[model samples]
Target: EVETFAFQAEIAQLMSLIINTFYSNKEIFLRELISNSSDALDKIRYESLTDPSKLDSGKELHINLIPNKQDRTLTIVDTGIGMTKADLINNLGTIAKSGTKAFMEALQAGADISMIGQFGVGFYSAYLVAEKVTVITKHNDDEQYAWESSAGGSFTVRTDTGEPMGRGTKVILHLKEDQTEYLEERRIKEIVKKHSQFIGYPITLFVE
Candidate 1:
């Protein structure tokens, strides 16, 4: 389904600044993403004690890094709380809804996990790597949806064509020429070991 909505003029500026400029260390993007993946696994594991169906991870939560030089792209897939169309818009597009302001405020106030976790937002940072992003996600409650964005102004959401993830989200990044470091297998492996070592799940690096 196609949808449209409005935001305050200042909000538009805030969105641009928060998404584009505020994030200083590009490499930390990986940390933010993996942190989110861990959180998802934690949620499922917690729920599973009461409901087996919610025990989404038979193994453990992990972050995968796949690089395709031929396509100049990389993908990070995770099992998480997949979003609906409304969730996509409110989660990915708007600021107040995703606790973006609070996330930024926390960074400004000094890195604090409680505040950032309370916000529960940050996956949108993939923009720093590519001109476009493709999100393939599935939910236990709803059909899978693919959300695509170029980060210029507008975005598109549609049903996905890729194989169902069963219960998670996959983010594909088309890296820019200057951001190609994200495609290096060794670099990604080191990053995973460095930041995601304590992630409470496995982290895999895939490349050729």
Candidate 2:
């Protein structure tokens, strides 16, 4: 059986440090998430080149931004390869393989892109503006799962309530009281087209 491990104290400390240090420009949060979504689509597209069946699901890759003022939620959803529960653990939890290690090695070796995309930890960024975050995801081979956290001591993962996308993922953000700036349509559109206009897939913000 797979084991469940408590986070090393250092890990939580590091997460706290990173979140506090990040968001130098708060608006970049949406840009960063959309960029990650674009990367996910790129991965699926590149993989599909060698395995045509990967595209057999007949769904186009895209990102959706849905803002609900009533609940003060700004959700960013991706029609890309969704993560399984195991993937949620591996990708969202713990230090990434060939990620920080590789970046540090490259720096030690005197490489390029100073403070660049070397860090593979992107999902946790949602905690910047959200009081609660829910990831509704489904993998082709696994059942849909909901992974949730408040950046509290721990997180919960269980079966999702809604139907899974034919093949993709959705992230719903419950914005903190002070995070309503993300609810502005003009701001969201500018962010999307500015950072992700050429992402090689459709990206939409639900204005209405």
Candidate 3:
């Protein structure tokens, strides 16, 4: 069943800062998002430690940066611990329960894997340069699905019957007019090399 949900105040403010904070530092979206991908990948690998059966990858654990020029979308794909619908809604519905100050702390401090769900706290950074953000993800415990929003205060979730992700998350950002620079593979690659170079996962530029 398709469902619609409103983001709590925490997310509401972030949505505003997405325009405000990101307007001043639009490029932080890339660093923040890529950092998130690395964190997710790390979480899955850490899970594989106890169960070993939780691991699933269509490919290895590398993240993919795919830019569609005509579509004006920039897609970031990560083979990580994807979320179940409940977890997805629970985590994303409210957002930043701990706030970005803590998010920055945990991000810099190298927080635990369990924090991935709450990390949705930072996902809103996508809105910095995007009009809409679409997430298609698959969890080992659940089937693939879709989550999307226009930063318009409410988001929708729908079951998707598209290609299997094997296991992980895919984020597609519909670029804004001035944000068109993100669709440039060169710029994204430069971004990766600059802020995300130290990330653990191999982020490949699939665009071109």
Best by TM-score: 3
lDDT of 1 at 57: 31
RMSD of each: 3.8, 4.2, 5.1
lDDT of 1 at 84: 59
lDDT per residue as tens, model 1, 1-208: 6443454343344446545664546666677777767776676667767888664534345567788888888888876655555666565423444366667677687864323335655565556567778877775667888887666556677777668677777788878788888888888887777766777777778758
| Candidate 2 wrongly placed segments (more than 4 Å) | 1-11, 18-24, 93-117
Best by lDDT: 3
Stronger candidate by lDDT (2 vs 3): 3
Better of 1 and 3 by TM-score: 3
| Estimated TM-score for each candidate | 0.79, 0.80, 0.85
lDDT (10s digit) by residue, model 3, range 94-125:
34666655655674698642243355655777
What is candidate 1's CA lDDT for residue 119?
60
Compared with the true structure, what per-residue lDDT tens digits does model 2 show for residues 1-208?
2233343444344346435653455565676677777777777778788888887764588888999999899988886777778887665532555455554466468754223244665555576678888888876767878877666446678777677476667788898897788899998887777766777777777975
lDDT of 3 at 50: 91
Q: What's the CA RMSD of model 2 in angstroms?
A: 4.2
